Amino acid sequence: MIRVAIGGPRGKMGQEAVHTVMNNENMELVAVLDHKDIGDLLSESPNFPASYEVPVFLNLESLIVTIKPDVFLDLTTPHQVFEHTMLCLQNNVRPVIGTTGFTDEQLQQCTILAEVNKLGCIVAPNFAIGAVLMMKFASLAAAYFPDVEIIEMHHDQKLDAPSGTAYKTAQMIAEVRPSHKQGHPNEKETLEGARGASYDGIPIHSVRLPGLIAHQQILFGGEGQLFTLRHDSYNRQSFMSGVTFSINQVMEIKELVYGLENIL
Amino acid sequence: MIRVAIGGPRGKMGQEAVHTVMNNENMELVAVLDHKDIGDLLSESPNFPASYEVPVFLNLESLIVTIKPDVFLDLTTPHQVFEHTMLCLQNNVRPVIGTTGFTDEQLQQCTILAEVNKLGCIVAPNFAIGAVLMMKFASLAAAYFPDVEIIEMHHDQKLDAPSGTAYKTAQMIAEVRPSHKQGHPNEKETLEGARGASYDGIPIHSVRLPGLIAHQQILFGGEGQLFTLRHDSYNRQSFMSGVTFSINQVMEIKELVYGLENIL
Amino acid sequence: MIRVAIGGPRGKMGQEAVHTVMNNENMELVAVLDHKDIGDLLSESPNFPASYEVPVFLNLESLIVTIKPDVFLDLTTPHQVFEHTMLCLQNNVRPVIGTTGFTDEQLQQCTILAEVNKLGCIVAPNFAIGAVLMMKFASLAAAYFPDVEIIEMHHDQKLDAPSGTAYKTAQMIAEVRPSHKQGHPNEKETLEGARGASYDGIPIHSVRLPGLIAHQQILFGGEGQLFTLRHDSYNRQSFMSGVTFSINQVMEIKELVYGLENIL
Amino acid sequence: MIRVAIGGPRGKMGQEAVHTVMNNENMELVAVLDHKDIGDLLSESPNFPASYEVPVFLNLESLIVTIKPDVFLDLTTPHQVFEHTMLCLQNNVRPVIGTTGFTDEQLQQCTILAEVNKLGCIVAPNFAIGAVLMMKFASLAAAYFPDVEIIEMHHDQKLDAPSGTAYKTAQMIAEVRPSHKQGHPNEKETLEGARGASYDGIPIHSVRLPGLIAHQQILFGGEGQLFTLRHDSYNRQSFMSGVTFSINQVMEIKELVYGLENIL
């Protein structure tokens, strides 16, 4: 059985994770770390619901000594992850961190402390197992098919192109793929931009339409063939089998692992 | 029965058309208009094969008076189509023209002459019925889904991006779709080119990989849905059901029609 | 301006339609026809919310005389549509019916009455414009590509295979496509069922997975090419541009139209 | 440099392999093993072309002693592979076998002999790297997404459904995926066959159309997401990067490897 506490239960990711943890047969949600803005009207922004089973704490120190969870799932913000991770790792709690955060120096302090205490920690910048396998498998495939393109498609409210997942995908592929540009050397755009963006010579195209959520295809060309990997995320439940896997696996490892590609 | 003569039988399109006409139950190939470069070694560049059934002519005047074909399928070059079309239309031969050619003034002379002689003429810049239906249907769909993107994919020897078919597709859609840009007004590329090219606000993306031949997808977004039209051409047989349809239909019309979208 | 009343506002389709009508600039939601089961606890099943702008009626007679809506959008049940449609058509209200209902005889009474009163009526068994265009366009395409397959994909709670939309698609195509079977005459299944179901010789395949919502692809083969039409519905907002179109168009027609393919 | 001899150079696979070996910078085609049917008119069925560089042998014993190739690529028939493989392995030639062949007992004799002689042998029932990676990656993915479907699409002259590649894919997945059926327990087909074939509960669907060559998609469902692997083969050049990889890698291994999934 794994007793889980969640930091940031009211967030978009947090509300899904609450549901996932409560519904996983071998997990029990035992506490949350939460606090609202001082200006939040309860009418607009309700409190996390009061229960005996899931008390709400405002600070992690207090949660840990009272509840002694097995696992802390941190769905807070990049400014808070280092102090939370260090606190867990000194108190025999396995932290599972969903974040874009940590400095180099901060991550090295966490890594060393997890190692000496023989305590697991997983830092997952992308919990969605389909996305992570897409990227992991693309990087293995690029040893055999060095000509590749990435097409990513999102809703039309998204502010950044290309997506973070496409940039990460291109970085992973570029660890394996020899650096080169693609397309005939003499090709020329007659409408500026037709060929897309380039990362290390890898073309990346960004589609933005109503109706779409989050989608990526990776297209590997070679003589006489096409090999394609695709991930479609229709909602934030897409991230939950990575949350589940991370909570299960953190219990079994004795060091810090950064990125789910390193343990799937 | 329709007695067909072919201009340019040794060309990439011509060799397919020869096969198609010979194998269509209701057509007979009765002559070809052909000539080689004065420097063509027969070892490299064979003559069209000699037969009693399919004589070879060097000029169209001579073909027409000797053979009196029902239909002339012109697979020659843009510099020759006007004189060929005029000659047919004055000699009771229905011309079917595969070309990017004609000036405005030339096409108006052909149109008027076909009309007065009550003789059909089809000019087809794209014979592939799947491509033409893709475009025709996209232009009807754009009345209901004004947010659309085009993704075109070709082999990596292609020199121009975007493809002619994508440009034509975008022009057809823009006849119906109100002019607007797409994507959040505040979106910004962090890798130049990610959002593609724009035609009248329609994004167009160009993929260039080994293995691919010629492919296009048109993606129509709206709330809660995606509607997609796609054409894949694996070889030049893709153009042959348009060749067949044009030869059949030219016999039945009494005026010049430019573009297969206007008669499918 | 079009003053709209909705029958069945708490239904899955109804709740979306309420939102759509309230948010369309040229429509005003002026009333609902609604009633709950006598055993519905308000705690489980709330009343439609009380407002001055949108009164709730238990019977349509009463709604019509008090509110005199321009359009009645019926999202009730097959047992109620005939009496509702007849009542509208005698009271100068344009009915827009979302239903699998009507008998032959019932529909003929509605058709005749709409015609004599010069009043529009639309009956839409499928409001999703992308789905309906998919089917309409497939039926036009089947004149040129008689070899076709349908692949439909839904969530894994769905009880019927194939879907109603696939059956309707196959019926529409079969109006145009000559009846024939496909696949080599000597082909044999070594694992029973591999080739799918057949409707008039058209193969139909049904995919059932978690994660999927409602999806269909129609694949048209021919020499050297593939032409594909696809619709993806991610949520019930997919049906709302047909609801909007129907309410707009019913005002402009003077007879009953059955199926949106007949007016898009 | 690797000196390669090819068995069966005039076969569909053989003619591609001849080209591939001749064009690979580090390979030299040094001989072929070939013979025609006694009834083959040279007019219909030409001899492999005569050259000093690539002599033609009728038996492998004779080829091996005269030419002493590094690698023998066997593109012959299942009845001949065992005797060819044994002969190579006793004569310091690395055999690379493209076949559906070998008995259990035959393969064990080859395995043992390769091991004692510290000589590489690769037996590849599927040379296409995209196909093999598709299958290998699907089997890894099935540890995280146990609900999966296979859709395979081929030309309409194919006699068997499902394809061998789909059957192999399903067998590979079933090594990892817990055995279960999919779809609602109460689902019912209203048109027989809609749900496809089942292998260990894995649904398999077979599409047969003109225009298609050889295609497979593997669809992995889970909450809120879809993860898809796809391979498209447009021609027999699709198999050639596996031929190249096998010839390179056989030189580096010291035992027999059956199936490219075991060394990619």
Coordinates of C-alpha atoms in Angstrom, one line a residue, chain C residues 64-227:
Chain C
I64 CA -46.0 28.4 -27.7
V65 CA -49.0 30.6 -26.7
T66 CA -47.1 32.5 -24.0
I67 CA -43.7 32.9 -25.7
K68 CA -44.5 32.6 -29.5
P69 CA -40.9 31.5 -30.3
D70 CA -39.6 31.7 -33.8
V71 CA -38.0 28.2 -33.5
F72 CA -38.5 25.2 -31.4
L73 CA -35.4 22.9 -31.1
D74 CA -36.6 19.5 -30.0
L75 CA -34.0 17.5 -28.1
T76 CA -36.5 15.2 -26.4
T77 CA -37.3 11.6 -27.4
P78 CA -38.6 9.7 -30.4
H79 CA -42.0 9.1 -28.8
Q80 CA -42.7 12.9 -28.5
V81 CA -41.3 14.3 -31.8
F82 CA -44.4 13.8 -34.0
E83 CA -46.9 15.6 -31.7
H84 CA -44.4 18.3 -31.1
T85 CA -43.6 18.9 -34.8
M86 CA -47.4 19.0 -35.7
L87 CA -48.1 21.4 -32.9
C88 CA -45.3 23.8 -34.1
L89 CA -46.3 23.6 -37.7
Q90 CA -49.9 24.6 -36.9
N91 CA -48.8 27.5 -34.7
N92 CA -46.3 29.3 -37.0
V93 CA -43.3 27.9 -35.1
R94 CA -40.4 26.4 -37.1
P95 CA -39.4 23.0 -35.6
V96 CA -35.9 21.8 -35.7
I97 CA -35.9 18.2 -34.6
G98 CA -32.8 16.2 -33.4
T99 CA -34.1 12.6 -33.5
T100 CA -33.8 9.0 -34.8
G101 CA -37.7 9.2 -34.9
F102 CA -40.8 9.5 -37.0
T103 CA -42.7 6.8 -38.8
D104 CA -43.2 7.0 -42.6
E105 CA -46.8 8.1 -42.1
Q106 CA -46.0 10.6 -39.4
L107 CA -43.2 12.2 -41.5
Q108 CA -45.6 12.5 -44.5
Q109 CA -48.2 14.4 -42.3
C110 CA -45.5 16.8 -41.1
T111 CA -44.1 17.2 -44.7
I112 CA -47.5 18.1 -46.1
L113 CA -48.4 20.5 -43.4
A114 CA -45.1 22.3 -43.6
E115 CA -45.6 22.6 -47.4
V116 CA -49.2 24.1 -47.2
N117 CA -48.2 26.5 -44.4
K118 CA -45.0 27.5 -46.2
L119 CA -43.1 26.9 -43.0
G120 CA -39.7 25.4 -42.6
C121 CA -38.9 22.3 -40.6
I122 CA -35.6 20.5 -40.4
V123 CA -35.2 17.0 -39.1
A124 CA -31.6 16.2 -38.3
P125 CA -30.6 12.6 -37.3
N126 CA -27.0 13.9 -37.2
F127 CA -26.2 17.5 -36.3
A128 CA -22.5 17.3 -36.6
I129 CA -21.6 19.2 -39.9
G130 CA -18.2 17.3 -40.2
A131 CA -19.9 14.0 -40.0
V132 CA -22.6 14.9 -42.5
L133 CA -20.1 16.4 -45.0
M134 CA -18.0 13.3 -44.6
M135 CA -20.9 11.3 -45.7
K136 CA -22.2 13.6 -48.4
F137 CA -18.7 13.9 -49.9
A138 CA -18.1 10.2 -49.7
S139 CA -21.3 9.5 -51.7
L140 CA -20.0 12.0 -54.5
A141 CA -16.6 10.5 -54.4
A142 CA -17.9 6.9 -54.8
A143 CA -18.9 7.9 -58.4
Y144 CA -15.1 7.9 -59.2
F145 CA -13.7 5.5 -56.7
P146 CA -16.0 2.5 -56.3
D147 CA -13.6 0.6 -54.0
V148 CA -14.0 1.9 -50.5
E149 CA -13.7 0.9 -46.8
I150 CA -15.0 2.4 -43.6
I151 CA -13.1 2.4 -40.3
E152 CA -15.0 3.7 -37.3
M153 CA -13.5 4.1 -33.9
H154 CA -15.2 4.7 -30.5
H155 CA -14.6 4.4 -26.9
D156 CA -14.8 1.0 -25.3
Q157 CA -18.1 1.4 -23.5
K158 CA -20.0 1.4 -26.8
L159 CA -22.5 -1.4 -27.1
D160 CA -23.2 -1.6 -30.9
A161 CA -20.8 -2.4 -33.8
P162 CA -20.8 -0.9 -36.3
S163 CA -21.9 2.5 -35.3
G164 CA -25.0 4.2 -36.6
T165 CA -22.9 6.7 -38.5
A166 CA -21.0 4.0 -40.2
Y167 CA -24.2 2.2 -41.3
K168 CA -25.6 5.6 -42.6
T169 CA -22.4 6.3 -44.4
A170 CA -22.5 2.9 -46.1
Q171 CA -26.2 3.4 -47.1
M172 CA -25.3 6.8 -48.6
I173 CA -22.4 5.5 -50.5
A174 CA -24.5 2.5 -51.7
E175 CA -26.9 5.0 -53.4
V176 CA -24.1 5.8 -55.9
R177 CA -21.6 2.9 -55.8
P178 CA -22.3 -0.1 -58.0
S179 CA -22.9 -3.1 -55.8
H180 CA -19.8 -5.3 -55.6
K181 CA -17.6 -7.1 -53.2
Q182 CA -13.9 -6.2 -52.7
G183 CA -10.7 -8.1 -52.1
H184 CA -9.4 -10.9 -54.3
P185 CA -12.1 -13.4 -55.1
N186 CA -9.9 -16.2 -53.6
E187 CA -8.9 -14.4 -50.4
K188 CA -9.4 -16.4 -47.2
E189 CA -9.4 -15.4 -43.6
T190 CA -7.1 -17.4 -41.5
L191 CA -8.4 -15.6 -38.3
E192 CA -12.1 -15.3 -38.5
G193 CA -13.3 -11.7 -38.9
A194 CA -10.1 -10.1 -40.2
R195 CA -11.9 -8.6 -43.2
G196 CA -14.6 -6.9 -41.2
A197 CA -18.3 -6.6 -41.8
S198 CA -19.8 -5.9 -45.3
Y199 CA -22.7 -3.6 -46.2
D200 CA -23.5 -4.1 -49.9
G201 CA -20.0 -5.3 -50.3
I202 CA -18.5 -2.3 -48.5
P203 CA -16.2 -3.4 -45.7
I204 CA -16.7 -1.8 -42.3
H205 CA -14.3 -2.2 -39.3
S206 CA -15.0 -1.2 -35.7
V207 CA -12.3 -0.1 -33.2
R208 CA -13.1 0.1 -29.4
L209 CA -10.5 1.6 -27.2
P210 CA -10.2 3.7 -24.0
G211 CA -9.3 7.2 -24.8
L212 CA -11.2 7.4 -28.1
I213 CA -14.5 9.3 -28.4
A214 CA -16.0 9.1 -31.9
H215 CA -14.0 8.9 -35.1
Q216 CA -14.6 7.7 -38.7
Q217 CA -12.4 7.4 -41.7
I218 CA -13.5 6.5 -45.2
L219 CA -10.8 5.2 -47.5
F220 CA -11.2 5.3 -51.3
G221 CA -8.7 3.3 -53.3
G222 CA -7.8 3.5 -56.9
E223 CA -4.7 2.9 -59.1
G224 CA -1.8 4.6 -57.6
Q225 CA -3.7 6.6 -55.0
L226 CA -5.7 6.8 -51.8
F227 CA -8.3 9.5 -51.1

